[PDB]
Amino acid sequence: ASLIYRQLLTNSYSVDLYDEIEQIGSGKTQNVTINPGPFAQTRYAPVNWDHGEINDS
């Protein structure tokens, strides 16, 4: 059971290796592509307000 202390001290180099893991995995580019769901969006339209038809003569 004392072997755990020896293993930790011996394998401590994996700490620096893990530091490299994380601090270059952050450097590497990742992009979680959140979707649009199966249900699709849509806006009304380009709508502009104006005065209606005028009865000229």
Partner: protein, 48 residues
């Protein structure tokens, strides 16, 4: 000073009657169809 007298209506000669505007008040009920979500369709980490 003319024939046509005592007729019911409103001619176009001077409808403003010297008033800047004719005003009307009322209530306005609209039942439009919004595009608004229901707080679903939004990513799982939608939070502080």
């Amino acid at each position: 000073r003319t024939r046509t007298v005592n007729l019911y209506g409103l001619p176009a000669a001077n409808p403003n009657n010297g008033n800047e505007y004719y005003e009307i008040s009322g209530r306005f009920s609209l039942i439009s169809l919004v595009p608004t979500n229901d707080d679903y369709q939004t990513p799982i980490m939608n939070s502080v």
